[PDB]
C-alpha cells in the first residue's frame, strides 16, 4: 500500500521523490509605463 | 555650493543655449480686410 508517505510510511519503504516540480514558473507582468515616454532629455554635461 | 574638499567651484550651473519663446497669437481679423491703394503724390 502507498498510504501517506513520511507520515504513514509506505509498505515497501521510504520514497525519495514525492512532489512534482513543474519547471515553468509564474512571473507577474511588468506594469505599463505611461509618463516615461512623454518628454525628451537635455543632457547636462560633465564638469558643471 | 557647500564647501567641497578641493575648494570653491566656479561653475555651478549649465547654461542651456535654447531659449523658450512664446508663439505669436493667431491673428484673425487681418485676413477679412479688402485693401484699396492710395496712389501717392496725394
Explained architecture:
This is part of a larger assembly, with 2 copies of chain A. With 48 residues, the first copy, chain A, is mostly loops. Chain A contains no helices and no strands. The interface between A and B is small, with 5 and 5 residues. It is classed as virus. The entry lists the keywords B2, virus. The entry is titled "Shigella flexneri bacteriophage B2 Icosahedral Reconstruction".
What features would you highlight for this structure?
B2; B2 Capsid; virus; rod-shaped; little secondary structure; 48 residues; 2 chains; part of a larger assembly
Tell me the radius of gyration of chain A: 28 Å
The largest interface is: A-B, 5 and 5 residues
**Helix count of chain A?**
0
- Count of DSSP strands of chain A: 0
Give the strand content of chain A. under 5%
Shape of chain A: rod-shaped
Query: Assembly type of the shown chains?
Result: part of a larger assembly
The helix content of chain A, as a percent range, equals under 10%
Structural class of chain A comes to: little secondary structure
Major sheet description of chain A: none
Distance between the first and last residues' Cα of chain A: 79 Å
PDB class: virus
Keywords: B2, virus
Entry title: Shigella flexneri bacteriophage B2 Icosahedral Reconstruction
Chains A, B: B2 Capsid
